[PDB]
Scaffold this active site. Structure first.
Site, PDB file in Angstrom:
ATOM      1  CG  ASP A 337      -2.267  -0.800   0.875  1.00  0.00           C
ATOM      2  OD1 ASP A 337      -2.381  -1.454  -0.217  1.00  0.00           O
ATOM      3  OD2 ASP A 337      -3.148  -0.791   1.764  1.00  0.00           O
ATOM      4  N   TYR A 425     -10.481  -1.587   0.499  1.00  0.00           N
ATOM      5  CA  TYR A 425     -10.342  -1.733   1.950  1.00  0.00           C
ATOM      6  C   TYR A 425     -10.202  -0.380   2.646  1.00  0.00           C
TER       7      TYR A 425
HETATM    8  N1  LIG Z   1     -10.416   5.515 -12.269  1.00  0.00           N
HETATM    9  C1  LIG Z   1      -9.409   5.368 -11.423  1.00  0.00           C
HETATM   10  N2  LIG Z   1      -8.824   6.398 -11.007  1.00  0.00           N
HETATM   11  C2  LIG Z   1      -9.043   4.020 -10.879  1.00  0.00           C
HETATM   12  C3  LIG Z   1      -9.207   2.866 -11.650  1.00  0.00           C
HETATM   13  C4  LIG Z   1      -8.855   1.625 -11.117  1.00  0.00           C
HETATM   14  C5  LIG Z   1      -8.331   1.525  -9.824  1.00  0.00           C
HETATM   15  N3  LIG Z   1      -7.998   0.302  -9.344  1.00  0.00           N
HETATM   16  N4  LIG Z   1      -7.394   0.119  -8.171  1.00  0.00           N
HETATM   17  N5  LIG Z   1      -7.124  -1.044  -7.777  1.00  0.00           N
HETATM   18  C6  LIG Z   1      -6.496  -1.250  -6.539  1.00  0.00           C
HETATM   19  C7  LIG Z   1      -6.799  -2.300  -5.672  1.00  0.00           C
HETATM   20  C8  LIG Z   1      -6.121  -2.439  -4.452  1.00  0.00           C
HETATM   21  C9  LIG Z   1      -5.120  -1.533  -4.110  1.00  0.00           C
HETATM   22  C10 LIG Z   1      -4.312  -1.605  -2.848  1.00  0.00           C
HETATM   23  N6  LIG Z   1      -4.807  -2.110  -1.719  1.00  0.00           N
HETATM   24  N7  LIG Z   1      -3.098  -1.243  -2.912  1.00  0.00           N
HETATM   25  C11 LIG Z   1      -4.817  -0.505  -4.989  1.00  0.00           C
HETATM   26  C12 LIG Z   1      -5.496  -0.359  -6.182  1.00  0.00           C
HETATM   27  C13 LIG Z   1      -8.168   2.686  -9.063  1.00  0.00           C
HETATM   28  C14 LIG Z   1      -8.576   3.917  -9.572  1.00  0.00           C
END
Ligand SMILES: N=C(N)c1ccc(/N=N/Nc2ccc(C(=N)N)cc2)cc1
Ligand SMILES: *[C@@H]1O[C@H](CO)[C@@H](O[C@@H]2O[C@H](CO)[C@@H](O[C@@H]3O[C@H](CO)[C@@H](O)[C@H](O)[C@@H]3O)[C@H](O)[C@H]2NC(C)=O)[C@H](O)[C@H]1NC(C)=O
Ligand SMILES: *[C@@H]1O[C@H](CO)[C@@H](O[C@@H]2O[C@H](CO)[C@@H](O)[C@H](O)[C@H]2NC(C)=O)[C@H](O)[C@H]1NC(C)=O
Ligand SMILES: *[C@@H]1O[C@H](CO)[C@@H](O[C@@H]2O[C@H](CO)[C@@H](O)[C@H](O)[C@H]2NC(C)=O)[C@H](O)[C@H]1NC(C)=O
Ligand SMILES: *[C@@H]1O[C@H](CO)[C@@H](O[C@@H]2O[C@H](CO)[C@@H](O)[C@H](O)[C@H]2NC(C)=O)[C@H](O)[C@H]1NC(C)=O
Ligand SMILES: *[C@@H]1O[C@H](CO)[C@@H](O[C@@H]2O[C@H](CO)[C@@H](O)[C@H](O)[C@H]2NC(C)=O)[C@H](O)[C@H]1NC(C)=O
Ligand SMILES: *[C@@H]1O[C@H](CO)[C@@H](O[C@@H]2O[C@H](CO)[C@@H](O)[C@H](O)[C@H]2NC(C)=O)[C@H](O)[C@H]1NC(C)=O
Ligand SMILES: N=C(N)c1ccc(/N=N/Nc2ccc(C(=N)N)cc2)cc1
Ligand SMILES: [Ca+2]
Ligand SMILES: [Ca+2]
Ligand SMILES: [Ca+2]
Ligand SMILES: [Ca+2]
Ligand SMILES: [Cu+2]
Ligand SMILES: [Cu+2]
Lengths: 715, 710
Positions: A337, A425
């Site tokens: 993260d 989350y």
């Molecule tokens: N339209 C967007 N800005 C956008 C599109 C897809 C997106 N996907 N995120 N996925 C995602 C899932 C988990 C984490 C994490 N716990 N590190 C980070 C990112 C996040 C944002």
């Protein structure tokens, strides 16, 4: 309390000043983060850069001058033949004059590929999918009722998965396709796509592989053909747009016992009993400073109890979620993260829900993937709450139908809280301060699970949670840095254990006494104090000062870990290089300015060759007798999803962390200075005497009406 | 209320059992308070739960209320061969039979095994007063206190158990103390071994004396040696260090009261007799005088989860340099763990908004005794949301914020046997999670400082060593998940190493989900040496809508380990402490893991937990009972003066639904708030209950402190 300012985050004004200085250097050719090309130079992050401990301690403890205030600035140099990321320290603040190189990594060639994803990059990915998936348009409408092209309220969206490839330098991401509805996280369509987005020219980006409902297809055109030709077993999804959607928080069902009224609430008619001023807090025995690092999250600094230092720093370092799966996206997922600005997704705390209505709510500013500094309302809160259990109590019976006295001290605790919601989350981060010198770090997990399309094969890696939904098995792991300076910088580490002895019974020689004795172990070298999950972790983990209390015992603080973590990946295998700290529930290192962090913003996207490898801090196996020590703590838990996680994982039983407790540090119970203590004494032939040192309170107050904003914008 | 089948005896019922027994002239009954051991007396009366078979037919199949009975424990000391015998007395109301319970052929130590009583202590004091007369000048010179004409400067004693080296002995080490505020922390350096086995207290003797590291044979011998100059003697307004009175100054003094809970709208749980309703929860409770707090017939959403969750035993096992210290293994059920539920102070022990409940106990008393505010029941905010989510639009705004304020219901009692105060909680969350918790506070068990003591403890004050010890607590958890017939399984993560299906030159090394089934009791008996799986599941054959078995998960919060060597002497009394978790098939002959007799005959007790596993029965689809050991090593330290504090000094377990409900069971709550954005207007704050900001005052503080017959 001006002194706590050395630890404070940058103000809106300071962020603007740093940004302006950078913008005045025309050679850097800087463009806004929002510009939709990768082939640009942009300032991705600006945050305060903490001065060296040596200088801070001379300022704090020896009257010396305030150290120079500086900012860390991360610049994405995409507008050149060989793109890279470079960091600078900008200062002084106020009045920036210089930018010096920061954390250089000469000889490393994957910095561009290692960089965090940005809003501009997501926009370009959306454009790539709208084009690349044109062959699938009718497939989309027939199977899902939603689309990527010409959509308004029935749009497909994607969740990206990291890391992005199979080796250092790659940027190839699996994208889980979903229906963009309320709680869209839980609506996968059965399609996943692999996109190579390494090139700074988005025109070169390509969908290189396609997965749908259990098979690989090579291209969007091949899947479209095979679907056209009636050779694909499709799952046609029902329309999601009276009852609430399963992924909604809206109430449904009924309890057998109706609850029609609000539950009990905290009132604070006397106002806060802590003194918060800037980033400095005083609360009874306690004194500390805090900051919210945009990159890594919450920290408390310069922690004292009773006017003596306990800890220079306690900080969140990294938060990971490591998945398995039947789908390629699922089997790819290892989220780190800090690679997403764990400290920058501190979204608005709702009074009376996220913190008590009586809490002090604090705003902050972040500059993380932004055109200007952004204002985050109610990013943090600080509040005192009754714990519901007394800190100490005793009924001293006379064993004759009465008593000699009752004594008790009502339980209260001070809570410093923030959150992190990167995507699905919501992590709730607490540091808690008890009136008796005990401090606790805690993380609670809530929000939505990372979920994939159900097929039968998924049940080996997860749990079916809905008709088309699998919750993938995973482990949450969090790393804390705990730079204890127990009564001062020079400490040692020791452990205590119970060991039985078998002796002649001293008063009946024909018999034996088999009984507990107290065993002490001293540790001289770092490797001896690096406890792997397979090793037995002693019940008493002590950080000691050479100073003794009045009874001849060394003044110590004890670390107690509350975790269900274990070894997840095999040590030394590929991406595990990024999380070598997760080998150790506890490791102790010698302090060093070059080892302030166990992770970085770059680890997520180059886990094979990251800039910090925690295991390397133990390589030199340094002497740790009478040194400045740092404890590093891994807490976590295996999460096997279950139907009760729908729509969200809940907090009860889903928290981990640790306590720091005084152990022969103080001559007696340090809460004894509290005047909240009550003692009831009997009186012959009369009513009891209730002895108090603070008058009984029955006063009343009301909180302000609830409000919530929901936006976070430059000011 | 059907819950009444589980309820404790009223004052009226206790008097009825007592009157009945006293009307039997051939029992030769005398009051507990009579100052002789050579008497027959009713020591304990409590409700004797009917068989589960009859209870479930009553509750579930509309059959007759089971017969209600009492357990009566009678000390028969007024006969040639004294013993303790227990009876079932009933029916209630209108008792007219008295049936003897649980014979033990060949066991000869019944009398020695019996708990100590107020009358026995009174006789021990007389014995010490007479026997220590030669030490009168030694007492005055070394301590300034004595046993004779002492008034405000009196010596006292703390007894230690178990009481000897073998089954049948009643030989007790007594720690001599100065009787001042918090007298527990004031040992004088003298310990005395008294043989008090005889029913004629005239025969009781001091058989050994220990002072400041040496044994002396008799009080007379210690006196002569003192006179002859042959003893190393230790000669012993701010508050006393053993007092709770405030002293010292914080760097930032606090002069005002902290935040408090208000409940202007009254309780959100329903309490009727011993029956509780709260949201999805329904359960009954009782406070068993012998063994403490139980919750029974626990339902969530109209479905049964547990027939019984109960405290079974609470032990503190010591090491020491002094004879008393090395002797001490306290087992609290041998002291009426459920009978020492002394008055909860409103605002301090429970919130001012709590519902406080009285009870009656008949334990070593002349008549049933009223205990005010013995328990409390309260809802309190946890300070953390049960769930929340900020649904960002990733463009400087949001799609919604959803949250549910955290609340829990707490059922609480305490036990203060002597020095320590244990706080016992059962806690119910709105999402079907329940927790059991015990917090330790009060005064430590402490002995006189000598240098040799530092091998068994910590110096806490000038003359005081806090002895090393382990606290261990045993719980019985009779889960009946959706029904009586259950199975036990565990889940683990295990890695697989496969070809990367989209890049075949590479590997995927990743988590898979591994399930283990258990067929036999012994397979589900986990020792402290064994790795405890992360998912401990009690499962029904019923499936949820997603095709997964409906289960409850057990999650243990403990720092316990193996303390005594398996098989060695007193360890026989605590064989359950070999197992953080063991699973047994339900049997009416195995309802308890301990007894009031274990303390004083730990060598040959009437219940040996290990024996429950001897027949190694099949546990596939049966009525299963989980048994849970939780505890911690306590190495005392200076912050334990005057009392051990609660923060970090708690152990227990959680029971969490696992595929039991089709979705989060808290979704029925109307407290949930969702905030939605609106085009060119203020956000819409969607509620299902109106916002409340009312405040009210609680009752003014009162505290009685007496517990007497009514
Ligand atoms: N339209 C967007 N800005 C956008 C599109 C897809 C997106 N996907 N995120 N996925 C995602 C899932 C988990 C984490 C994490 N716990 N590190 C980070 C990112 C996040 C944002
Ligand atoms: C990462 O990219 C940055 C920015 O492009 C690199 O720093 C830049 O390096 C160049 C060339 O080394 C410097 O440019 C100029 O080069 C001419 C050569 O004739 C020289 O005469 C000038 O004095 C000047 O140095 C440039 O100043 C420098 N920019 C900054 C902001 O420092 C960096 O080297 C790249 N990193 C790696 C590891 O390749
Ligand atoms: C403690 O030590 C004693 C003495 O060494 C052990 O007792 C002996 O044990 C063996 C049986 O294994 C007997 O044959 C001897 O007669 C015993 N000797 C005495 C003096 O009693 C005892 O087993 C030890 N106990 C533990 C738990 O270690
Ligand atoms: C969230 O906060 C912002 C900032 O205070 C609000 O913006 C203000 O809107 C009001 C309209 O009532 C104006 O009076 C101000 O001029 C605005 N200020 C700025 C800086 O824009 C915004 O209205 C709030 N949004 C919601 C949905 O409550
Ligand atoms: C314990 O003592 C009791 C009471 O003295 C004994 O119980 C009596 O036993 C005699 C002969 O067996 C009966 O006639 C009486 O009716 C019994 N009295 C009662 C009140 O039950 C008993 O035998 C002794 N127990 C043991 C194991 O010896
Ligand atoms: C997973 O399995 C692969 C294949 O068996 C292991 O990789 C082999 O390792 C040997 C010895 O290191 C090499 O010489 C082979 O060339 C490898 N084979 C392939 C196909 O790559 C790998 O080590 C295993 N990984 C783990 C963590 O167990
Ligand atoms: C503790 O409780 C008892 C019981 O209520 C109190 O005793 C009563 O006091 C009233 C007022 O003096 C007397 O008139 C009654 O005769 C008493 N009732 C009984 C049943 O004894 C007692 O005063 C309380 N003690 C303290 C110290 O508050
Ligand atoms: N934890 C325990 N079980 C326990 C610990 C210490 C203990 N010692 N009690 N001593 C004790 C001495 C005298 C009396 C009397 N005057 N009535 C009562 C009790 C008794 C029990
Ligand atoms: Ca090192
Ligand atoms: Ca340090
Ligand atoms: Ca059995
Ligand atoms: Ca059962
Ligand atoms: Cu999870
Ligand atoms: Cu203890």
């Amino acid at each position: 309390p001006r002194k706590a300012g050395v630890f404070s985050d940058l103000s809106n004004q300071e962020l603007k000043a740093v940004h302006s200085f950078l913008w005045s250097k025309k050679e850097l050719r800087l463009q806004p983060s929002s510009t939709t090309t990768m082939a640009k130079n942009t300032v991705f992050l600006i945050e305060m850069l903490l001065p060296k401990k040596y200088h801070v301690l001379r300022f704090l403890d020896k009257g010396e001058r305030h150290p120079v205030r500086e900012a860390r600035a991360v610049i994405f140099f995409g507008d050149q033949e060989h793109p890279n990321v470079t960091e600078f320290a900008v200062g002084p603040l106020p009045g920036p004059c210089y930018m010096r190189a920061l954390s250089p990594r000469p000889g490393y060639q994957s910095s561009w590929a290692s960089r965090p994803i940005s809003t501009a990059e997501y926009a370009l990915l959306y454009h790539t999918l709208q084009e690349a998936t044109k062959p699938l348009h009718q497939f989309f409408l027939n199977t899902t009722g939603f689309s990527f092209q010409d959509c308004h309220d029935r749009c497909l969206a994607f969740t990206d998965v990291a890391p992005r490839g199979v080796a250092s330098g790659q940027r190839r991401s699996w994208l889980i396709i979903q229906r963009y509805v309320e709680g869209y996280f839980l609506h996968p369509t059965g399609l996943e796509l692999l996109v190579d987005h390494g090139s700074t020219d988005a025109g070169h980006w390509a969908v290189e592989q396609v997965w749908y409902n259990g098979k690989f297809y090579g291209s969007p055109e091949e899947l479209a053909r095979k679907y056209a030709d009636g050779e694909v077993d499709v799952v046609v999804l029902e329309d999601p747009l009276e009852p609430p959607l399963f992924s909604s928080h809206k109430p449904r069902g009924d309890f057998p016992s109706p609850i029609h009224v609000s539950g009990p609430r905290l009132v604070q008619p006397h106002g806060p009993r802590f003194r918060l001023e800037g980033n400095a807090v005083l609360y009874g025995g306690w004194s500390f400073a805090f900051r919210l690092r945009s990159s890594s999250g919450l920290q408390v600094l310069n922690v004292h109890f009773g006017g003596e230092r306990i800890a220079y720093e306690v900080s969140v370092q990294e938060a990971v979620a490591l998945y398995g799966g039947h789908t390629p996206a699922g089997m790819q997922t290892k989220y780190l993260d800090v690679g997403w600005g764990l400290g920058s997704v501190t979204h608005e705390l709702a009074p009376g829900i996220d913190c008590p209505e009586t809490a002090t709510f604090l705003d902050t500013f972040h500059y993380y993937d932004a055109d200007d500094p952004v204002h985050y309302p109610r990013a943090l809160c600080l509040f005192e709450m009754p714990t519901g259990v007394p800190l100490r109590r005793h009924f001293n019976s006379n064993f004759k139908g009465g008593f000699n006295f009752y004594a008790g001290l009502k339980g209260q605790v001070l809570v410093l809280r923030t959150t992190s919601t990167v995507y699905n989350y919501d992590y709730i981060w607490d540091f808690i301060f008890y009136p008796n010198g005990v401090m606790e770090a805690k993380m609670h997990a809530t929000g939505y699970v990372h979920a994939t399309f159900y097929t039968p094969e998924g049940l080996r890696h997860g749990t079916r949670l809905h008709t088309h939904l699998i919750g993938n098995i995973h482990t949450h792991l969090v790393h804390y840095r705990v730079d204890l300076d127990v009564a001062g910088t020079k400490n040692s580490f020791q452990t205590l254990q119970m060991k039985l002895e078998n002796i002649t019974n001293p008063w009946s020689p024909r018999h034996r006494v088999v009984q507990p004795t107290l065993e002490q172990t001293q540790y001289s070298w770092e490797r001896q104090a690096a406890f792997r999950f397979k090793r037995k972790l002693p019940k008493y983990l002590l950080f000691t000062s050479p100073q003794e209390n009045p009874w001849g015992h060394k003044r110590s603080y004890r670390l107690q870990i509350h975790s269900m973590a274990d070894q997840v990946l095999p040590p030394g295998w590929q991406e595990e290089q990024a999380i070598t700290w997760a080998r150790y529930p506890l490791a102790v290192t010698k302090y060093r300015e070059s080892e302030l962090c166990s992770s970085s913003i770059y680890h997520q996207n180059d886990p094979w060759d990251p800039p910090v490898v925690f295991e390397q801090f133990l390589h030199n196996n340094e002497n740790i007798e009478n040194e400045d020590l740092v404890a590093w703590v891994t807490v976590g838990f295996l999460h096997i999803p279950h139907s009760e996680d729908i729509p969200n994982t809940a907090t009860p039983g889903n928290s981990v962390g640790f306590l720091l407790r005084p152990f022969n540090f103080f001559p007696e119970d340090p809460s004894l200075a509290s005047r909240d203590t009550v003692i009831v004494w009997p009186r012959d032939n009369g009513p009891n005497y209730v002895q108090r040192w603070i008058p009984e309170d029955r006063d009343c107050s009301m909180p302000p009406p609830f409000s919530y904003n929901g936006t976070y914008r430059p000011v």
